[PDB]
Amino acid sequence: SELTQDPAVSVALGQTVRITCQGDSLRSYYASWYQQKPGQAPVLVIYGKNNRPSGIPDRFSGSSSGNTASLTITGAQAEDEADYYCNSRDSSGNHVVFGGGTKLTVLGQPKAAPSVTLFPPSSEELQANKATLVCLISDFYPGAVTVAWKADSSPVKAGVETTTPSKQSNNKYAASSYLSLTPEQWKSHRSYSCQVTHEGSTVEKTVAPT
Amino acid sequence: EVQLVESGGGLVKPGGSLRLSCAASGFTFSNAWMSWVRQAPGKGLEWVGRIKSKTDGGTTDYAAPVKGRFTISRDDSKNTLYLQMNSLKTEDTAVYYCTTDFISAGPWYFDLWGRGTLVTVSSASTKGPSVFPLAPGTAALGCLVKDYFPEPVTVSWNSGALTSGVHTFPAVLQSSGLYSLSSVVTVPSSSLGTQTYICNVNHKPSNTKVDKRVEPK
Amino acid sequence: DGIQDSGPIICAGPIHSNKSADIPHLLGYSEKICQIDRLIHVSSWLRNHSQFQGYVGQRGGRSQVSYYPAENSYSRWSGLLSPCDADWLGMLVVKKAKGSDMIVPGPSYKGKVFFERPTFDGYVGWGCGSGKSRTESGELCSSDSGTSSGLLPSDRVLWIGDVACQPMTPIPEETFLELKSFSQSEFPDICKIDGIVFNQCEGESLPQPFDVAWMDVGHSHKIIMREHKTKWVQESSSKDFVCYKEGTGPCSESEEKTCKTSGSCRGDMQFCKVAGCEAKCRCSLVHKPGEVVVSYGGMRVRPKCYGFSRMMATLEVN
Ligand SMILES: *[C@@H]1O[C@H](CO)[C@@H](O[C@@H]2O[C@H](CO)[C@@H](O[C@H]3O[C@H](CO)[C@@H](O)[C@H](O)[C@@H]3O)[C@H](O)[C@H]2NC(C)=O)[C@H](O)[C@H]1NC(C)=O
Ligand SMILES: *[C@@H]1O[C@H](CO)[C@@H](O[C@@H]2O[C@H](CO)[C@@H](O)[C@H](O)[C@H]2NC(C)=O)[C@H](O)[C@H]1NC(C)=O
Q1: What are the cysteine partners in each disulfide bond (chain C) (predicted)?
Q2: Range of the domain at A190
Q3: Distance between CA A92 and CA A110 in Å, rounded?
Q4: CA of C135 to the centre of ligand 2 (A)
Q5: For the domain B130-214, what is the CATH code?
Q6: How far is CA B135 from the centre of its chain?
Q7: Which residue in A113, A175, A199, B156 has the most C-beta neighbors within 10 A?
Q8: Three-state DSSP state, A165
Q9: Cis peptide before C24 (omega within 30 of 0)
Q10: Are residues A149 and A180 in the same domain?
């Protein structure tokens, strides 16, 4: 039988949030709780009646009541932004059931501007009759950027693919954009630039065939 | 030193077969219940099944969506858990984790996880990548790994000696359906030519291995 | 007092360092309650009866013990005593399991180092030696690498049932016999509970799990009940207060005797009202709904333990 969680919940930096899991198994049996950050394996944080694995600070705590189990996080930090799963056994004891997950957003994080890096078409790649502009964008928050590309100062709208921002180990974001050109248009212009706007402010960098 | 390592992940055709294994170390594997837990891209954790220790009957249990096509087994003599996957569907595309209860004893208290192995069920073909050098108070240099499928590509620097300043970015999924990623290591502009940096690219799905050297051009 | 408590009665969970440390005998009431908080009584039980080395309750203490069922009322008040607690205070004995003591289905036993349950005629505890823990069925102790430190978390301890134990008002034998008869009339098809004759039968089925309310009033076995009323009386006697020398821990026996008999110490509002007041030692109310008084079969008694828990029963065969 199933564990129901809310899909999403927010908390202000330093404040307390409580994530609840509901299911009939929880009347007899304890839940356990997992924190999963993107690109990482789940980490167990609470099990049984409020037991913490070693290395889990007591800011995470567990409770149960009736057919509900709850995970409570005091003094929320940016490092707590994660998906939180509850689990338990089913009625028979022959299976393990996970809740659907709750995405925890932590509000009030400090805004950071993006450090931008631009690489030109590698010379080995120019032996292969292809050219790709490699614009890396790192260390920004929040994780939402717009990218624009320039052939001298003209809007380059074909052959560009940007990633969705992803969270780094330092709880800031990273992204890339790639403009691909035939080595003609790389040399048909003296000036290329990748122009990155983050919260109304645009950082820019430029490379040249020189 | 207590750890679980999954392997066997890769690209498989729809309807195909694939065996995952999980290698355990640092503890008495025979005493452990071993579970598989998977996560399709962007979705929730889903328990696949488990095999109990012989002490508790060594029996198996499976989630309903994989019953009949998936079989779990263990070889205690080689410290290894297995997941035989048959009749694979595209929604079986997931990262697969093996896990156990090591210190938090109890059938569903998973405190020990492997890092997971990606299984891609798709009609597309594996493609190995083109690897290109990227040349420069501080200095920015790296490799750009172009046009591969599927994930992942592991990038190291100087066989793993150059461990700091390294920023391997997440890959872009091009409209072509192929992936590309760049890895950049910050070094001083300052031993530019005195020291060699070689980036080691590895694409296990295509058995590609490319060590490529950096210099200022 | 009456307010539900999420924490220890007096002492924060133990951070042991030496698995070979001695378990001192402490004479003071609050000293004993501090040990109860830290699960030092369950550790002592396991050393004596299972040749276990070290402790259970490392870092977590008594308020991180596991219960079956997980939905448990009396654990919400830290001051209500469990059977193991009452054992440490000398009010009852949690006995070592014999092979004939039936292990009830339902609890999740895998990995536990200790568990206990009330039985029809007492309280039984099951332990494991060093480096071992219970199998899924609870029947054996198998080798377990996770226990190597001998400083084990509270989750390795399982207490079965919703149970509160307290100083009782002893009753005459004739009162027990009348209670027993009313109990027999409410469960007339039951033959044996936990291997003890309850009703005379010729045929009987095999033992099956059996969830029941019960009270322990002394004498030869428990009184199981269906229709009964309970009421909680708040009491303020000396067992209702604990005494802490803040900085050091629980007050010593002689310091506690002085505060509770001579009115020369500090404490909360109720302790000053009943005992009198003036660093120093301070005494305050423990958290519980009070003492449980049970109405059953026309009588009213104050039992030693009351609760709802799982036993093994056999039914009559026609
Ligand atoms: C595990 O075994 C322990 C003994 O090996 C036992 O400790 C003993 O407990 C008794 C009863 O509480 C104490 O008895 C007497 O202690 C003082 C004398 O020093 C008297 O003033 C008291 O009235 C009491 O009669 C023993 O002192 C104590 N022995 C030691 C060495 O500490 C534990 O109680 C046993 N564990 C369990 C769970 O029963
Ligand atoms: C753990 O504690 C015990 C007892 O508190 C220590 O054993 C004592 O060791 C000293 C000298 O090392 C002896 O004088 C005592 O007679 C011993 N007592 C007992 C009961 O054995 C033990 O050394 C401690 N271990 C540590 C601190 O690592």
Answers
A1: 11-34, 128-141, 165-305, 191-201, 243-283, 251-281, 259-265, 272-277
A2: 115-207
A3: 48
A4: 33
A5: 2.60.40.10
A6: 29
A7: A175
A8: coil
A9: no
A10: yes
Structure-determination technique? X-ray
- CA distance from start to end of chain C: 51
CA distance C9 to C287: 7
Q: State residue C260 phi and psi, 5-degree precision.
A: -85, -15
At residue A188's C-alpha, the angle toward residues A183 and A194, to 5°, is: 80
Give the H/E segment covering residue B23.
strand B18-25
Q: Which two tokens stand for residue C274?
A: 């009943």
- Looking at the fold, whether A101 and A120 belong to one and the same domain comes out as no
C12 CB neighbour count, 10 Å cutoff: 13
CA–CA distance, A201 with C63 (Å, rounded to integer) = 53
User: Based on the number of CB atoms within 10 Å of its own CB, is C257 exposed (0-12), middle (13-18) or buried (19 or more)?
Assistant: middle
How many Å from the N-terminal Cα to the C-terminal Cα in chain A? Answer: 66
Radius of gyration from C-alpha coordinates of chain B: 20
- Tokens 């590698």 correspond to A122
**Domain locations in chain B?**
3-121, 130-214
Residues of chain B numbered 38-97 and touching chain C (CB < 8 Å): 52-53, 55-57
Task: Name residue, tokens 């005992």.
Answer: C275
Asked whether residue A191 falls in the same domain as residue A153, the answer is: yes
Peptide bond into C14 cis (omega under 30): no
Chains that touch C (3 or more CB pairs under 8 A): A, B
Ramachandran category for residue A49: left, alpha or beta (phi over 0 → left; psi -120 to 50 → alpha): beta
The ligand 1 atom at the shortest distance from the C-alpha of residue C48 is 1
Length, in residues, of chain C: 318
Q: Whole-angstrom Cα distance, residue A61 to residue C47? A: 30
Q: Which atom of ligand 1 is nearest to the CA of C44?
A: 36
Query: Which one-letter amino acid corresponds to residue B209?
Result: K
CB A11 within 8 A of CB A73: yes
Q: Calculate the dihedral angle through the C-alpha atoms of B67, B71, B72, B75, rounding to the nearest 10 degrees.
A: 160
Same fold yes or no, B3-121 and B130-214: yes
SS3 A26: helix
Cβ of B189: how many Cβ atoms within 10 Å? Answer: 12
Nearest CA in chain B to A45: B111
Rounded Cα–Cα distance for residues A201 and C195 (Å): 80
- Identify from C58, C59, C108, C110 which residue to disrupt to test chain B contact, counting B C-beta atoms within 10 A and taking the largest count: C110
DSSP A74: S
**Contact assessment for residue C171 and residue C295, using Cβ atoms and an 8 Å cutoff:** no
Structure tokens at A13: 């930096």
Domain limit, last residue, from A63, A86, A107: A107
**Three-class secondary structure of residue B153 per DSSP:** coil
Of A67, A89, A107, the position where a domain reaches its end is: A107
Q: Is C221 in contact with C121 (CB distance < 8 Å)?
A: yes
Rounded distance between C-alpha atoms, residue A186 and residue C279, angstroms? 82
Contact with chain A for residue B113, Cβ under 8 A? yes
Do A125 and A182 fall within a single domain? yes
Write the single-letter amino acid at A104.
Answer: L
* DSSP letter, residue C137: T
Question: Angle, to 10 degrees, between the axis of helix C253-262 and the axis of helix C29-37?
Answer: 120
Runs of H (alpha helix) within A50-197: 123-126, 183-187
Measured between alpha carbons, how far is C82 from C101 in angstroms, rounded to an integer?
20
Number of domains comprising chain A: 2
Strands C162-165 and C305-315: antiparallel
Helix C29-37 × helix C40-50 angle, to 10°:
80
Residue C20 CA, ligand 2 centroid: distance in Å: 7
SS3 C228: coil
Of C17, C67, C8, whose CA–CA distance to C38 is shortest? C8
CATH number for position A142: 2.60.40.10
C63 contact A CB<8A: yes
